[model samples]
Target chain A: SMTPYEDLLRFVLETGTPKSDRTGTGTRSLFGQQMRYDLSAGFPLLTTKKVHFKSVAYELLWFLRGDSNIGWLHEHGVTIWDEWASDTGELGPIYGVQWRSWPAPSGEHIDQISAALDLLRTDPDSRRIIVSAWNVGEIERMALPPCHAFFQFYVADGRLSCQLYQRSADLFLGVPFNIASYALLTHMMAAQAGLSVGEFIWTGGDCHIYDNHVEQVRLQLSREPRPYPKLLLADRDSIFEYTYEDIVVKNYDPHPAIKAP
Target chain B: MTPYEDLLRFVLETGTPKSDTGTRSLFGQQMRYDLSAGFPLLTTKKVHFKSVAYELLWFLRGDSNIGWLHEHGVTIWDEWASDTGELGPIYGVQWRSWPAPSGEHIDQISAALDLLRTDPDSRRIIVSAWNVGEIERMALPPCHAFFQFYVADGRLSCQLYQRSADLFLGVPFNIASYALLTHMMAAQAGLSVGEFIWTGGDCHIYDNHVEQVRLQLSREPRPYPKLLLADRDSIFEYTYEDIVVKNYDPHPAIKAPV
Candidate 1:
């Protein structure tokens, strides 16, 4: 489903200009890129290279439960967040906190994720059903700025669709993981709201391939892309109740994995 | 003509049945227009460039009330304002003064431009109007909300992620508003202008404006006019008179109720 993702890799490898970045990693970056994955078609896990689906599921499920600590993720064998967490295992008010308990001026917290779920069940046609992880005042406190920053929900003819806007992305290392995470969330949202799945649109700003990942990206780009895997998400009594076993990926046959770091 | 019109036809043909006031709408859409291709003012239907310019200036001013807009004879925001002429802390107010728990306000617009001037390659150059915690306090949540600026090859490009769009009457104004800001920002940063990318979540057309969409679709898109932004002391000092659109000749504006 994401030959377009391959198309983007090729486009950047040739067309992107070299620029210096915060990591001093030096990037060949293109600003403002987009990709669409039809969830109704199949899951968007890259068949070009194997992605760790367990990690993606755990990370998404972790975000839903309003847990900021990565200990829960570690218990599930996902060390994807090890590089950014604190000694006390704090990641600060990152995605899960912002999504589930956004701080307010009135000494109260707003559960944006639950609020959005309610919006889906109630005002399905409403255009303002949005959840934002890019809280203005909290960026400095978080371990990292939100990359998959904001998302919105839309409904039509009993189908639920979501669009995510990420201010920055690592097209090679990050985007496929992001697409899979959001697509799974969309499926869960649709299932919870009793609607069928629709498209998951990923809009990005500052789309770049790290200079380090270029060789691996070109390797992955050279491979033939297989049809994307299908998401077999089991229903949960609550959106936050799904665990690793409830989330499954079927028909995923991929080329061997390529390491970036 | 701009691809803005093409988007109108796109929604009309491919859109699903929904909305009020009853209409068809699509979920996600993106439009790219190069700044090199003249200002993206819609020439198919005469747009209120004055309102567009004045409203932006108003937003940049961080004025939460409609007094400035009313003073400028722009009524686009009049209906949303309370009897006291307040809009809570809406778009531009958030742009200039996003509230902090420490009792300080962040002028996101100024900070963004300063970063562009100091470190154009910084990926953190962004301004968001969607203050999630404050949505209930405002007359309406921000629509053309979160926007980010990116610089490469000595050219400044901006991408705005708007959560919702009203394609017929509203989208043109939004295009012109950001396009105008793009030019102003590039000028202030001493960089040339690049492209303006508008990404919308729910781009919709009101059934009320389907007749106007039909009428405008019947006509060919006309050439866009050039925007002449006069030399200003600062981005904050841009007055309505300093910005003008030249050679704008279009079919008479198609009228519809707000």
Candidate 2:
């Protein structure tokens, strides 16, 4: 199968509706799309343009830490979240809060990451291995509700596969970040469980190409995709213990970055 | 653009092969059906429409116990129910009363309906069944786990993400169940129905049911039947009798073992 990144843009271009959204920027949107990438082939860093790997890794680490404050992201030189942060640098119980410490009625917080990891290691055959960030009760308080709302991990033949259901996808900028983020998470998970990476399935709900990014998308489709980059991670016993220094992306030669709206 | 019967054959033949529970399985399959053309009831076999209607009504009533199903002469849930007719907190419980840490239960179905009626363009009209807190308490975990609603041009569309799907025995019923829900929801919201997209993870056909799959595949598919609903003032007020299927002409129903 060809890299589905271009296919996604083509589908939305051919069939998308001109729908108005929360950002007040009109979009050409289509609903319900699924794209699969085999991680063993290579890391799916977009060869069309350079995606900021540092920001992707740091943001994922922040989620793993259950830290909602942007201070850590800012300290790491990532400003993707600056537009949504409060004065105190809080994003108000977003992905990290939901993933690491889902609140329980008995006043005990549910550590979904540890729980899911334990299940993957112990009972890999279970279909209930899910991590959800769409807390219905707390949507109002969050700076922005989760776009990659729910994901499930599947294990077959001693290999780990992940499927993410993202509610809203910015195909030009956000989809590549989401793909890399989950693929990396799958790698870390496969390592922790002593398994191999199978496939990273990305499913989008409102998959769209913003009206402003049309030219960039055209330029991206014209170029041939290069060989995917390889990710090297330091030996770590726990998912939270790994830092930016331990994670590296090698041989990511690509075109110039296109400024995001 | 073909009906999902093609998809059934596609997964059985070309899906990544794996072994699970005496069956060859595939992972990550998706299909789409447009509701405007016609209803998506499988024409190759005689789907038990009565069971489908009763089960959907029972879910809407928020009654998890199989007692209601039994009372309505629907035995589809009999295999999973306890002797006391309890089936634990399954789909109905998760849909109607999702528990909150604050001791309040969120009525997700009602909330979804309200959201559709109020802000149809909002991107977050979702209802999930995989409650991490409530999974241990269920008799059987949800198969059709999560679904979301999308609205555009005064037409409502729905997409269901099923974590586990039994391609031979379950997919037909699951497709019909969601299609009906989307239609009824569109009716209540005063909008026409659009498309029902079905996405699956771990889609598999049991080795034992391969004969059944072959028999149905050999049979020719007929035109999709249409659904007719009696005019109702409110969605919550409609019952099983209010909905009807019309013009369901088809080839002879292929009899296959369950």
Judging by DockQ against the true structure, name the best candidate: 1
Worst 10 residues of 1 chain A by lDDT: A1-10
Q: Residue B192 in candidate 2 has what lDDT?
A: 96
- Pick the TM-score winner: 1
Task: Compute DockQ for each candidate against the true complex.
Answer: 0.79, 0.54
Q: Per-residue lDDT of B1-258 in model 1, one digit per residue for the tens?
A: 367878889999999987547878998899988887788988788888889999999999999999989988899899888999999989987899999877889999889999999999888888999998888889998999899999988888999988889898888999999999999999888888888999999999889888889998998888888888889868999988889888999888988766
lDDT of 2 by residue, A13-114 (tens): 878999766778888988999999998878888878888888999999999999999999999899999999998898888999999998755467889889
Could you tell me which residue pairs clash in candidate 2? none
Q: TM-score of predicted model 1? A: 0.97
Model 1 Cα lDDT, one tens digit per residue, A1-261: 457678887898899989876768789988888888788988888988988778898999899988999999999899989999999899999999999988888778999878888999989999899999988888889999898999999999999999999888889888888988999999998998889999898898999988889889989988998888778877688888888899879899889878878
Window of ten residues with lowest summed lDDT in model 1 chain B: B18-27
Q: Write the per-residue lDDT of candidate 2 for residues B148-186, one digit (tens) a residue.
A: 999889899999999988888888899999999999899
Give candidate 1 regions above 4 Å deviation: A22-24
RMSD of 1: 1.4
